[PDB]
Structure formats: structure tokens, C-alpha cells
Amino acid sequence: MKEFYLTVEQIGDSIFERYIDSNGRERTREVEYKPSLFAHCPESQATKYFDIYGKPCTRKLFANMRDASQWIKRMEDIGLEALGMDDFKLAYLSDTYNYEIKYDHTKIRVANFDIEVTSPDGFPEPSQAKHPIDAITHYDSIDDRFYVFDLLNSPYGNVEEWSIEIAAKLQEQGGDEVPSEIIDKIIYMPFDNEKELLMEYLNFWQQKTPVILTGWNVESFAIPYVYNRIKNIFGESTAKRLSPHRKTRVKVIENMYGSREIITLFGISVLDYIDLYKKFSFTNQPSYSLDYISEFELNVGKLKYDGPISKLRESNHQRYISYNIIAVYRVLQIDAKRQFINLSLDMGYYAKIQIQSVFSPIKTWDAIIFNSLKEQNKVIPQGRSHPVQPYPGAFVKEPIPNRYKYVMSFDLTSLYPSIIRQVNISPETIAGTFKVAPLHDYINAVAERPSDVYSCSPNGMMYYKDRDGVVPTEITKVFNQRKEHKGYMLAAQRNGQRTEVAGMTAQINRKLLINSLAGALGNVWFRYYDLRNATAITTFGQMALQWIERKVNEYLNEVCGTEGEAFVLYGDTDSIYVSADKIIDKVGESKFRDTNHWVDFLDKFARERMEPAIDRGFREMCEYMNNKQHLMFMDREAIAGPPLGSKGIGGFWTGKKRYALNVWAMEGTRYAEPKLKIMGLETQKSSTPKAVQKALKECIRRMLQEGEESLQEYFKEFEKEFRQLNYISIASVSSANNIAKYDVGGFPGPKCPFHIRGILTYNRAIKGNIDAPQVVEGEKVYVLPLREGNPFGDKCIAWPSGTEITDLIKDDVLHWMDYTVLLEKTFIKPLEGFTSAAKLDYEKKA
DNA sequence: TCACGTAAGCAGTCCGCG
DNA sequence: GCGGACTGCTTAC
Ligand SMILES: Nc1nc2c(ncn2[C@H]2C[C@H](O)[C@@H](COP(=O)(O)NP(=O)(O)OP(=O)(O)O)O2)c(=O)[nH]1
Ligand SMILES: Nc1nc2c(ncn2[C@H]2C[C@H](O)[C@@H](COP(=O)(O)NP(=O)(O)OP(=O)(O)O)O2)c(=O)[nH]1
Ligand SMILES: [Ca+2]
Ligand code: NA
Predict the structure, then answer these.
(1) Are both A744 and A788 inside the same structural domain?
(2) Largest alpha-carbon pair distance within chain A?
(3) Which of A161-164's residues contact partners 24+ apart within 8 Å by CB, and which partners?
(4) Residue A811 neighbours by CB distance under 10 Å
(5) Residue A450: CB less than 7 A from any atom in strand B
(6) b/e per residue A444-470 (b: at least 16 CB within 10 A)
(7) In this structure, is the CB of residue A753 within 7 Å of any atom belonging to strand B?
(8) Is the domain of A532 the same as that of A626?
(9) What does the radius of gyration of chain A's CA atoms come to, in whole angstroms?
(10) SS3 breakdown of chain A: % helix, strand, coil, rounded to 5?
(11) Where is the site labelled Essential for viral replication?
């Protein structure tokens, strides 16, 4: 069988690698890797190594990775380029596995674990590990078993063994209702004391060493707590056993808010699922706790319980253990749907990197490009330092705030990667420059043609047409791979066999990699950073969008015989929005039998008339810029309008990036019932309260489908009833940054943000109460305004999102929450923006 | 929120300033 | 009042 690596590390002059051999067995080996770097040489010095610019290079074989690292220093001292992959472990992977890696995931030990710690005096800080670990559930992907470690005796009480029979009982039987598909997969291990529990866990850890270590908040809590707790009791020599190479290190994470403290376990790849979720899910959630996410993803959260979790083990040890098992399983269910782990394994093995590097698109792309270049015996350039500088981005047209009855939309296919491929943009394909005219001249095709020999961008860059660049070459491959999976996602959407969400992630998360490459060219840490290339992409995007805007207006003017009219109402980056009122009027709205009739008509007109006109409109631009390959593909997206015969307005814009459409068709998907397409509005902002999002969305639905009278009817009913709503559902949400920065003596300091003020108000209310939930820096909070004269002392209070507010102050908050201010700022004010733009009244006049 | 990007809207604070 | 400069936060693409 083909060999593939599991983990790889660099410790001194040795490479530590865990891998699967040809027999399918997991092996470990330490290799004295002798790396090689490159330096430019005279042409007379024959070689097979050249850089990306065709300049000859000499291969320097070093006795060890130390000599190679020191050589880079000397070359820097001299001031000459030191070419080659300076990340020696990546080069080792490239040499060891010089072929496309086809891995077997069943041989990869993926570990999903979570722990429980009873703490009567606040959150148990992993740096201290003051309190005993009384529960550990450890799922092993190879064994397909849930190994449960249960502490029976601790200074916080002695308990009886957990019952698997009771845990299997339904909730209405007093049981825990632990899923039947995992109850037979539970391995229960009771322990008389903590030392025995931890000792056995390490023996368990060494026998089944995790390759992929995951869970929820395992990196910031579970891993450092276990490491420190074992350290305090047995010493670091025993805590080092958590690594298969017996080597760890305390890693400090830097950001714009302070430093962090995690533990690096060499030989292990940690993929904390909360980090995998935040990056790959394409959602911004009010709360990122496991219970909130499980509710969103699975319509079911963690196991519910009574009283604080600090007293759960003593009061209901049965539930306490079952709660712990379910926590681990919830992550396995979320992953079975999201497939973020399998995505990471795909990306990591495709790029030939450490699996945990999938968090970094830069490192990922650097190794893809390196391996690609090495294949042709080409040598990558040395990374350089650059000052952070801004550069132009996409174009956004200022829409006229108004209702728009009939709307048809068109969008380009993966614009930026396509631009890269079409123009042939790459660090080595640069050919020169041309004198630039104002951009509006290229849009109107009145400026002189840039070149008859090179592929050009309206930013002034010229690229070779007859040679390949590594960047267009490698981005094409990943683009094509997504296209193959996208051919499966649209199926399930139209058929809705199944496949969708996973087939969605398969395609949508692949695009995150290909979209990040264009951005990478504008990041100073990318090896192939170049603002000329990065601007060439975005400027081309600006041109193409407004070029096709002009072309669509021209085509629709001559076809409708109207002259000079504006059909394109709005555009953003890769899309355009066309008013279809005039098209409908040509046939006559009375000549349509029903809603589907005019939808079928606009669909036929878009495909047979507009689309071929659009493609012709792009082929000439391709000729104008003398591009290498025509790839500006813009096809029909949405078809929107009110129901036939109704009083709905179909859609509306309030401004840039803010609009609502009543869509009947999306590409190949024809909706049985009209779907709302709402972008940018408060219904989409996670900072808007849950019950307000729903109410606003219903206000919008009535505007687009039913009209003014229905909207006013619903508004009047919502204002009369909204006080009944649960306080959490009407609470605002916001991320909490730099709390201490605006903290002066527990009271709001200068320029204190409104939500931060709510946090300080909360901190005073719970001050002295060591068991009360603490607002964490960098996390999110629920926010409620407070009526004047409230006992809390300020205009608002804020508490951790995704949770009920503590029973200490809950009754007071309910009594003093300002329903009026809440209604005006979150509901009425945005609704005023929607209706005034749509020329509608949410309240009666005369 | 730990070396993909820019564009751009709304909430709120504090400032000249008339 | 009231408008702009600014921070903070959010989304679209
Ligand atoms: N092409 C390339 N090689 C690199 C780079 N960085 C380090 N190397 C190193 C990796 C390799 O150590 C060396 C050249 O590897 P090969 O010519 O592809 N195969 P050969 O039969 O010559 O192998 P050996 O040298 O063991 O005889 O340059 C890089 O960026 N590019
Ligand atoms: N750097 C960067 N640019 C982006 C990102 N998202 C969008 N852009 C810019 C670059 C993109 O070229 C452009 C549009 O990106 P899509 O909305 O994803 N449209 P596509 O046709 O690719 O996906 P589908 O086939 O599913 O419709 O916006 C991003 O996360 N990063
Ligand atoms: Ca698209
Ligand atoms: Na696109």
C-alpha cells in the first residue's frame, strides 16, 4: 500500500515523523534530514536548477538543518538571496512523498475528547489546575469506542458508579436518553482516586496515541488543564508523556488584544473544532458554546440539568457522567454533517503540510506552489519583508433607494480566480507595463488597446500569453476539483438524494482556499506578495463589472427600444441586478396566466437573449485586453418579483450591500414556494435580537409578497404583543473587546462603547459572587437597555451570550429592561429604513 | 480574534461650532 | 440641536 505521513516535527537536527507504512502499520522514525538550499550561479556553471525567472541556481547540500539555517544568516549578512524552502519539514515531506498522496482515513487515529472539572470558586483556570479532573470521555476513531474515565472519590464528594442502564432510559423514565447507536460503544472505567485515573489515562494515551486531536475548546481548556494537572501531581517528566516524542512547549499566542497560553504537543496535530467551525462554517453566531452550536446544527443541545454545573456531580452524578459523554458525541454529530476534519485531511495531504496548517491559507498555498515548482526542478524565491500597504478592491454601484418590482440577477463564475487564469497573473509571468488611461475609458472602450502581444489588466500590468504561471496553474486545479463537487451540490438542491450539506462543504470550503490565494498576493507575509498582481486582479474586476453593465444597458435599450435608460440598478464585485419591469410590460402583465408563467418567461429571456449577449460582451473585452483565455462566464442567478395579482412590491434596496428580494428561481433551482433573498439587512446581522430578526423578516416577507396593508396589520399586532417575548430573544448581541481598556474603577471610562458599558454594569452586580458566570474578553454578550432609575446604576447590562442570566439579578433585569428603547432601536428604526426606501408606511396616515 | 483581501453599512461617543 | 471624526462592530463579495 502507498505510504503516507501522520505527523511531522523538527527537533534540533532531527525530523520526527509518525506515519503509515506499506503494510498499513503505524510507525515512528527519527531522521537526520540533510536539507538543501539554493544560490544564484553564473550560466557557465551547468545545473538543472533554475528559479521562477529562468535564472540558474546551485544546490547546496548541508550536513544538517543547523548549517542550512546558519547559511541563510550569512547570505543575509552578505545581502544575497537564499533560495529554497526554509521550512525544512515541508521539504522533507516533499522528498519522502514525491507523489500525490492517496491516504486511508481509517488508519488515522482521530481523537475526540472532553473533560469535566468541579469548581466551587469560579472557572477552573488550566494554567493553575487547582481542582481535580473528575471525568474524561475519550472517543477513538479507530476503535469506534467512547472510553469514559469516571472519578468516584474526590474532595468534592464521593459518588456511586454511573449506570449505563439508566443512561439508556428515556428522559420520561428519569433517564438520560443516550443514543442507542453509541450506548454499546461505551467503555466504562471507574476509579477510586484521581492519581489512578490519570495514570491509566496516560497508559491509555500511549497505547492509542492521537494523530488528530479534537473536541470543543480542547486547545484552550481540556489540553492545557490535563497537562498542568498531571504536571502538578506527577511532574513534567510525566506530563511530557502526552507527546509521542516526549517533547512539549508552552506556546504564546499574539493578537490585537493580548497574549494567550496554550500547550504545544509535538507529534500531535490539534484541530480544535471550535476553531474549525469559526473558519469553515461561513456563519457568524451569537454564541460559540457547544450547546448553542449543537442547537443550530442538530436541533438539540447538550444534556439539560438542574442547578449550577459546580454542584451537578454531587447532586446528580448519573446525569453528570452522561452529560460528559453526550458533549463528545455532539461534536461527532456536528462533524458528520460538516466534515471539517475530512476537509483538513484533504487539504493537508494535498498541500503536503502539517494537518494543523490548514488554518493558514498562506502556509497551505506556499507548499502547494513549492511542490509544484519542485516537480519541474524549479526553485522558490526567498521570502522578503514588506511594509503593510492598502490597495483598491471591488466595485460597488450606488443603488437608488427604491422598491423594485421585477428583478433578474447575473453573476460571474469565481471572478478573482478566473481573472488570474484569464489574464495569466503570476510572479513569473510579468512581462512589463503600459501607460494607463482613466479606468472609465477602458470601461467605455474609448482608451487605446494596451497591447497586441501581452495579456493585460486595466491597472497597467502586462503578462506573457505563451507561457504558464504556477499561480494560474495551481489555482485551476483546485477550481476544477470544486467544480466536480459543485456538480453534486446543485443536484441535491434541485432534488430537495441527500449529499448536500457535506457536498456543499466539499465545494464551498474548497473555494475558501482558492479565494484566499488572490488575497494572499496582497499579504506581506506571502512568499509571492506583490501589490501589482493583487491590484491587477481587483482592477480587472472593476472593469469587467462596469463593462458588462454598459453592455447590458445597451442591449436592453435596443431590444426594448427605449434609448439611454438604466436597466442595471445595482452591482457588487461580480454581480449585476437588472430591472425587468420594461421586459414584463412588453408582453403585458395581463397576458400572464399565473406567477410561474412570467417566471418561465424571464428565465427563457435570460438564457436565450441576455446570456449570449453577455458572453459576446465579454469576448470583446478579452480581445481588448488581449487576454490569454476567455473565462468571464456570467449566467443568470435570481429571478425575483411579487406573486401575480398580489400587492407585494417584489423587492427593495436601501443602499449598498442592503437589499431584499422575493426569489422564485435560483440558477437551476425553481422554488415551489418563493424564497426570501435578504442581504446586509438586520435580519442577517447576528447583533440583531432573535425575535426581532424573525419579526423584521416577516415584515419584509409581507412587503414583498402581500403589500402595505398586510405589513401595517402585522406591525400593529407586533407592537401590542412584543412585551410577551422572552428576554433573551429580544436581547442584542455584540462581541466584547478591550473591556479593561474602558474600565475605570468598575465604571464606564472615556469613549466606553454601549455594550462594554453593559458589561461593567454586570460586573458590579455580580461582584463578590465567585460562582457567577464571568464575561470573557474576546467573547460575545447579550445586551439589554435599562430604564432610568434602575438598581443596576446604568443605562444597560450585558451578560455572556448563549446563556440565561444568573438568578442573582435575573428578576431585577426583567423588571427594569427598557421595552420602549428596545423596540425603537432594534425594530422600528431598521423598519423605518426599509419602508421609507420602499415608499411604504408601517403605520397608517389618512 | 494565530502571517487571504477590500468595500461599506449602522450604533454610539465626543468633538467644534455656531 | 447638529454634523463630522473616530472607535467598534458587522456584513457582502
Ligand atoms: N526544486 C527544488 N528543490 C529544492 C527546493 N528547496 C530545497 N530543495 C532541495 C530538495 C532536494 O534535497 C534538492 C534537489 O532535489 P531533486 O533535484 O528534485 N532530486 P535529486 O535526485 O537531485 O535528489 P538528491 O539531491 O537527494 O540527489 O533540493 C526548491 O524550492 N525547489
Ligand atoms: N480575498 C477574498 N476575496 C473574496 C472572498 N469572498 C469573496 N471574495 C471576492 C473574490 C471572489 O472572486 C468574489 C466573489 O466571490 P463569491 O461570492 O464566493 N462567488 P463564486 O462564483 O466564487 O462562488 P459561487 O460559485 O458559489 O457563486 O468576491 C474571501 O473570503 N476572500
Ligand atoms: Ca458565482
Ligand atoms: Na465569482
Answers:
(1) yes
(2) 92
(3) A161/A188, A161/A190, A162/A188, A162/A190, A162/A317, A162/A318, A162/A321, A162/A322, A163/A318, A164/A188
(4) 10
(5) no
(6) eeebeebbeebbbbbbbbbbbbeeebb
(7) yes
(8) yes
(9) 31
(10) 40, 20, 40
(11) 665
Residue with CA nearest ligand 1 atom 11: A36
Residue with cell 446604568: A794
Query: How many Å apart are A271 CA and C6 C1'?
Result: 38
Q: What grid cell was written down for A811? A: 428578576
A223 shares its domain with A290: yes
CATH for A759 = 3.40.1820.10
Q: Per DSSP, what are the bridge partners of residue A389?
A: none
Q: Do A122 and A16 belong to one domain?
A: no
State this model's resolution in angstroms: 2.3
CB of residue A522 closer than 7 A to nucleic acid strand B?
A: yes
Gap from A276 CA to C13 C1', Å:
22
A482, three cell numbers: 470544486
Q: Is the CB of A679 under 7 A from strand C?
A: yes
Q: Which nucleotides of B are covered by protein (CB under 7 A)?
A: 1-14
Residue recorded with cell 550561479: A41
DSSP letter assigned to residue A401? -
- Rounded Cα distance between A610 and A677, Å, is 22
Question: Where is A677: in which H helix or E strand?
Answer: strand A669-679
CA dihedral A709, A714, A720, A723 (to 10 degrees): -160
Residues forming beta bridges with residue A255, ordered by sequence position: A258
Kind plus residue range of the DSSP H or E element containing A135: strand A135-140
Cβ-count burial A415-430 (b if 16+ within 10 Å, e if not): bbbbbbbbbbbbbbbb
Rounded Cα distance, A113 and A221, in Å = 11
Work out if A285's Cβ lies within 7 angstroms of strand C.
no
- Any residues with Cβ below 6 Å from ligand 1, and which? A 36, 59, 84-85, 91, 95, 370, 373-374, 377-380
Residue length of chain A: 846
Based on the fold, state whether residues A210 and A259 are members of the same structural domain.
yes
The reply to whether A364 and A320 lie within a common domain is: no
Q: What is the CATH number of the domain that holds A687?
A: 1.20.1280.300
Phi then psi for residue A61, to 5 deg, are: -85, 120
Query: How far in angstroms lies nucleotide B10's C1' from the CA of residue A655?
Result: 12
Strand C bases within 7 angstroms of protein beta carbons: 7-13
Of A429, A458, A456, residue with least CA distance to A521: A429
Report which of residues 553-572 in chain A place their beta carbon less than 7 angstroms from any atom of strand C: 572
Q: Which residues does ligand 2 sit against, CB inside 6 Å?
A: A 413-416, 511, 515-516, 518-519, 573-574
- What does each C-alpha distance from A308 to A323, A671, A727 come to in angstroms? 13, 47, 21
Q: How was this structure determined?
A: X-ray
Q: Give the number of the atom of ligand 2 that is nearest the alpha carbon of residue A417.
A: 12
Give φ, ψ of A839 to 5 degrees: 55, 45
Nucleic strand B under 7 Å from the C-beta of A422? no
- The answer to whether residues A437 and A350 belong to one domain is no
Cβ partners under 8 Å of residue A488, min gap 6: A499, A503, A506, A507
Which range of residues forms the domain containing residue A740? 728-818
Q: Where are the beta strands (DSSP E) in A23-134?
A: 26-31, 36-40, 49-50, 56-61, 110-116
The C-alpha atoms of residue A69 and residue A651 are separated, in whole angstroms, by 61
Secondary structure of A272-331 as H, E, C letters: CHHHHHHHHCCCCCCCCCHHHHHHHHHCCCCCCCCCCHHHHHHHCHHHHHHHHHHHHHHH
Please tell me whether residues A211 and A274 are part of one structural domain: yes
* Residues 349-408 of chain A in contact with strand C via CB under 7 angstroms: 394
Q: What is the DSSP string of A691-721?
A: HHHHHHHHHHHHHHHT-HHHHHHHHHHHHHH
- If one residue of A416, A475, A508 were mutated to test the ligand 2 pocket, choosing by the most ligand atoms within 8 A of its CB, it would be A416
Report the separation in Å between the CA atom of A120 and the middle of ligand 1, taken as the mean of its atom positions: 59
